Write an enzyme that holds these catalytic residues in place. Structure first.
Site, PDB file in Angstrom:
ATOM      1  N   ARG A  21       7.662  -9.989  -6.122  1.00 50.87           N
ATOM      2  CA  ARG A  21       6.711  -8.911  -5.899  1.00 50.87           C
ATOM      3  C   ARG A  21       7.430  -7.569  -5.918  1.00 50.87           C
ATOM      4  O   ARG A  21       8.096  -7.204  -4.953  1.00 50.87           O
ATOM      5  CB  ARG A  21       6.011  -9.119  -4.556  1.00 50.87           C
ATOM      6  CG  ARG A  21       4.674  -8.419  -4.411  1.00 50.87           C
ATOM      7  CD  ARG A  21       4.100  -8.656  -3.017  1.00 50.87           C
ATOM      8  NE  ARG A  21       2.738  -8.154  -2.867  1.00 50.87           N
ATOM      9  CZ  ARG A  21       1.657  -8.757  -3.350  1.00 50.87           C
ATOM     10  NH1 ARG A  21       1.769  -9.899  -4.021  1.00 50.87           N
ATOM     11  NH2 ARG A  21       0.464  -8.220  -3.160  1.00 50.87           N
ATOM     12  N   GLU A  59       2.994   2.468   0.108  1.00 52.29           N
ATOM     13  CA  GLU A  59       3.329   1.369  -0.793  1.00 52.29           C
ATOM     14  C   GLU A  59       2.276   1.226  -1.887  1.00 52.29           C
ATOM     15  O   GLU A  59       1.088   1.453  -1.661  1.00 52.29           O
ATOM     16  CB  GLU A  59       3.424   0.053   0.000  1.00 52.29           C
ATOM     17  CG  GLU A  59       3.590  -1.229  -0.834  1.00 52.29           C
ATOM     18  CD  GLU A  59       2.258  -1.896  -1.195  1.00 52.29           C
ATOM     19  OE1 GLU A  59       1.224  -1.577  -0.559  1.00 52.29           O
ATOM     20  OE2 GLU A  59       2.247  -2.755  -2.108  1.00 52.29           O
ATOM     21  N   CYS A  73      -4.525  -0.184  -5.502  1.00 58.40           N
ATOM     22  CA  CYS A  73      -3.712  -0.194  -6.714  1.00 58.40           C
ATOM     23  C   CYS A  73      -4.437  -0.603  -7.992  1.00 58.40           C
ATOM     24  O   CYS A  73      -3.851  -0.537  -9.070  1.00 58.40           O
ATOM     25  CB  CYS A  73      -2.540  -1.149  -6.533  1.00 58.40           C
ATOM     26  SG  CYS A  73      -3.039  -2.877  -6.739  1.00 58.40           S
ATOM     27  N   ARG A  86       7.376  -3.650  -5.776  1.00 57.82           N
ATOM     28  CA  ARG A  86       6.524  -2.592  -5.272  1.00 57.82           C
ATOM     29  C   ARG A  86       7.280  -1.289  -5.095  1.00 57.82           C
ATOM     30  O   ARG A  86       8.484  -1.286  -4.861  1.00 57.82           O
ATOM     31  CB  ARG A  86       5.933  -3.025  -3.926  1.00 57.82           C
ATOM     32  CG  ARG A  86       5.021  -4.256  -4.015  1.00 57.82           C
ATOM     33  CD  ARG A  86       3.775  -3.906  -4.794  1.00 57.82           C
ATOM     34  NE  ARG A  86       2.797  -4.985  -4.897  1.00 57.82           N
ATOM     35  CZ  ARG A  86       2.667  -5.802  -5.939  1.00 57.82           C
ATOM     36  NH1 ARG A  86       3.468  -5.697  -6.993  1.00 57.82           N
ATOM     37  NH2 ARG A  86       1.679  -6.688  -5.954  1.00 57.82           N
TER      38      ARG A  86
HETATM   39  N1  LIG Z   1     -12.279   4.190   1.339  1.00 54.25           N
HETATM   40  C1  LIG Z   1     -11.633   3.229   1.974  1.00 54.25           C
HETATM   41  N2  LIG Z   1     -11.652   3.244   3.344  1.00 54.25           N
HETATM   42  C2  LIG Z   1     -11.018   2.292   4.053  1.00 54.25           C
HETATM   43  N3  LIG Z   1     -10.326   1.260   3.573  1.00 54.25           N
HETATM   44  C3  LIG Z   1     -10.320   1.267   2.176  1.00 54.25           C
HETATM   45  C4  LIG Z   1     -10.920   2.174   1.332  1.00 54.25           C
HETATM   46  N4  LIG Z   1     -10.693   1.849   0.003  1.00 54.25           N
HETATM   47  C5  LIG Z   1      -9.976   0.776   0.038  1.00 54.25           C
HETATM   48  N5  LIG Z   1      -9.703   0.352   1.331  1.00 54.25           N
HETATM   49  C6  LIG Z   1      -8.934  -0.797   1.719  1.00 54.25           C
HETATM   50  O1  LIG Z   1      -7.620  -0.546   1.242  1.00 54.25           O
HETATM   51  C7  LIG Z   1      -6.882  -1.742   1.247  1.00 54.25           C
HETATM   52  C8  LIG Z   1      -5.818  -1.667   0.153  1.00 54.25           C
HETATM   53  S1  LIG Z   1      -4.715  -3.088  -0.020  1.00 54.25           S
HETATM   54  C9  LIG Z   1      -3.633  -2.797   1.420  1.00 54.25           C
HETATM   55  C10 LIG Z   1      -3.506  -3.997   2.338  1.00 54.25           C
HETATM   56  C11 LIG Z   1      -2.631  -3.732   3.554  1.00 54.25           C
HETATM   57  N6  LIG Z   1      -1.286  -3.175   3.298  1.00 54.25           N
HETATM   58  C12 LIG Z   1      -2.331  -5.000   4.384  1.00 54.25           C
HETATM   59  O2  LIG Z   1      -1.159  -5.311   4.750  1.00 54.25           O
HETATM   60  O3  LIG Z   1      -2.818  -6.145   3.972  1.00 54.25           O
HETATM   61  C13 LIG Z   1      -7.935  -2.815   1.040  1.00 54.25           C
HETATM   62  O4  LIG Z   1      -7.966  -3.765   2.139  1.00 54.25           O
HETATM   63  C14 LIG Z   1      -9.240  -2.017   0.919  1.00 54.25           C
HETATM   64  O5  LIG Z   1     -10.411  -2.711   1.416  1.00 54.25           O
END
Ligand SMILES: Nc1ncnc2c1ncn2[C@@H]1O[C@H](CSCC[C@H](N)C(=O)O)[C@@H](O)[C@H]1O
Length: 327
Positions: free
Chosen positions: A163, A119, A81, A165
């Site tokens: 929060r 999300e 995000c 979203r």
């Molecule tokens: N190219 C990519 N490949 C794999 N993971 C990635 C990515 N780019 C971002 N991410 C991962 O995407 C996540 C977005 S935040 C989402 C967190 C998740 N819903 C949980 O509950 O905590 C981050 O942890 C980031 O490291």
DNA sequence: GGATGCGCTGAC
DNA sequence: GTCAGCGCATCC
């Protein structure tokens, strides 16, 4: 998180993309679903994910052949995000971290799951005059999916945190799902003060800054909103102090300020930021969830995460709709 | 990586 | 003007 007796998702398989702490995994498994694939490229997130689920998520999703991803019924993705957040530069799809949705579309196009559950932050819904949300909607429709989107605030679902979203639920058209509904809000009866750890376990987080300016008097009655009591420095992010009788501010992943990523709170006459375990609780994570050994990484992880309870209500409703198959 | 002072937009 | 914000910039 809450207990779900009626396991609406039993027998369903899902994948956990942009897994992070595995928030979507906790929520869907609580409804009976089975995780069959996880993807997360951050070193420390993979470690904490493994600590809790015994699996190391696969790396960089942009380099994964979507054909190698296991068959599944539900695709979960709380994608990046930074490119859409009101707190960022808002470069959107122009940001190298803002094109991950198209990777999701690539996977959906190939695996065609029954449901796509995504999300992102509230601003995602208004970014670029609504064009960003429209692009996702149209992309999903082009892939033959319905598109249900709504901004939900965690404070309306039993968790004391403001929060907001956007949740996007997409059903494959052939399923003819016409009764999906977002969870209805209900009265909040839990506040920050109810999730705090004992003072003895958080003394190291107490800070006494001489530039503290208390602007509002403490409230004695709990309220379902953030209540700022004062500031330190110039009052920027991480420099704002709130009442524990109110709700927590949104936890952030790259947040700065002296009360970085959690905000500051007035607790028993002292000002301090939250402990990683309190962050977990503010995010709806059970105390049984193991936090990462690096506090800095733990704050980052919870700041990037999802409120389990909210996902649980949505997941239960997704299952409720999938299971309504009258003659 | 860890820590923290700040930018500056969206929504009142 | 007021407040909030899965963030950014810069230092070690
Ligand atoms: N190219 C990519 N490949 C794999 N993971 C990635 C990515 N780019 C971002 N991410 C991962 O995407 C996540 C977005 S935040 C989402 C967190 C998740 N819903 C949980 O509950 O905590 C981050 O942890 C980031 O490291």
């Amino acid at each position: 998180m809450i207990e779900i007796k009626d396991k609406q998702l039993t027998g369903l398989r899902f994948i956990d993309l942009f897994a992070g702490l595995g928030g979507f995994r906790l929520a869907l498994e609580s409804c009976g679903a089975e995780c069959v694939y996880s993807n997360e490229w951050d070193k420390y997130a993979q470690e904490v994910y493994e600590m809790n689920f015994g699996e190391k998520p696969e790396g960089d999703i942009t380099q994964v052949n979507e054909k190698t991803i296991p068959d599944h019924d539900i695709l979960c993705a709380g994608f990046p995000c930074q490119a859409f957040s009101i707190s960022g530069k808002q470069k959107g799809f122009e940001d190298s971290r803002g094109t991950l949705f198209f990777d999701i579309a690539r996977i959906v196009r190939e695996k065609k799951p029954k449901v796509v559950f995504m999300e992102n932050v509230k601003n995602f819904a208004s970014h670029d005059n609504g064009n960003t949300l429209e692009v996702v909607k149209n992309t999903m429709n082009e892939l033959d999916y319905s598109f249900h989107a709504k901004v939900l605030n965690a404070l309306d679902y039993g968790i004391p945190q403001k929060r907001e979203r956007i949740y996007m639920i997409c059903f494959r058209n052939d399923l003819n799902i016409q009764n999906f509904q977002f969870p209805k809000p209900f009265e909040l009866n839990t506040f920050v003060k109810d999730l705090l750890l004992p003072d003895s376990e958080v003394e190291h987080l107490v800070i006494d800054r001489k530039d503290l300016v208390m602007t509002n008097q403490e409230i004695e009655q709990t309220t379902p909103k953030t209540v700022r009591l004062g500031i330190v420095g110039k009052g920027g992010q991480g420099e704002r102090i709130y009442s524990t009788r109110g709700i927590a501010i949104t936890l952030s992943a790259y947040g700065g300020g002296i009360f970085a990523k959690t905000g500051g709170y007035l607790v028993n006459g002292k000002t301090r930021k939250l402990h990683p375990r309190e962050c977990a609780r503010v995010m709806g994570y059970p105390d049984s969830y193991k936090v990462h050994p690096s506090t800095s990484q733990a704050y980052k992880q919870f700041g990037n995460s999802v409120v389990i309870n909210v996902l649980q209500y949505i997941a239960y409703n997704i299952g409720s709709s999938l299971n309504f198959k009258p003659y």
